């Protein structure tokens, strides 16, 4: 607990205690209808997306805003029963592919994306699965914490930061992202600042 807490990005406690960004801000930093799989429909102007039922496909979405500096955190809400075989949460550059023709951990399967498999607890970056390391059951809601001053991506569950999952991100422009496989899944994004 001391180890994880001592690793926290600067300013995270005050970001999380601040009056949360309003709906307009959540929509401006939400899912981009112009930057998602053809099998995904962005709803509520960015607050959530719904993946249509399509067999043998993995489908992702990016947020509207890419981050290159500062601290950025957003809550992902993803119902436990709508995760299926591969539910991956993280970030991507604008170059990562958002669709593939099979069920896979698409986010993090290349050098343009970084993801946490919230079902298996594994981290993916340039990984097809074998050798992916374990990282700290994920409930419906989780916090995604992108520190672009240090260049790390980490997560929090139930108010506890679990440490950096990925490092060496400085010099890139990174967007919130997920890859999903479940028909009719509804994945919410709630930008919290900065």
């Amino acid at each position: 607990e001391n180890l994880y807490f001592q690793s926290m990005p600067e300013g995270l406690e005050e970001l999380l205690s601040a009056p949360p960004p309003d709906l307009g801000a959540q929509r401006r930093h939400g899912w981009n209808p112009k930057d998602c799989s053809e099998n995904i429909e962005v709803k509520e102007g960015g607050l959530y997306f719904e993946r249509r039922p399509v067999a043998q496909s993995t489908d992702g979405a990016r947020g509207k805003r890419g981050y290159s500096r500062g601290l950025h955190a957003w809550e992902i809400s993803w119902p436990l029963e709508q995760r299926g075989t591969h539910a991956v949460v993280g970030v991507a550059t604008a170059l990562a592919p958002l669709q593939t023709d099979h069920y896979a951990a698409l986010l993090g399967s290349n050098s343009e994306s970084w993801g946490w498999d919230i079902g298996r607890g594994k981290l993916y970056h340039q990984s097809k699965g074998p050798g992916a390391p374990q990282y700290p059951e994920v409930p419906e809601r989780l916090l995604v914490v992108l520190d672009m001053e240090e260049g790390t991506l980490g997560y929090a569950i139930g108010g506890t930061y679990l440490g950096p999952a990925f490092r060496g991100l400085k010099g890139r422009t990174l967007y919130p992202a997920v890859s999903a496989v479940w028909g009719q899944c509804q994945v919410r994004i709630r930008y919290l600042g900065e």
Partner: peptide
């Protein structure tokens, strides 16, 4: 599978 996967509700598809």
């Amino acid at each position: 599978i996967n509700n598809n």
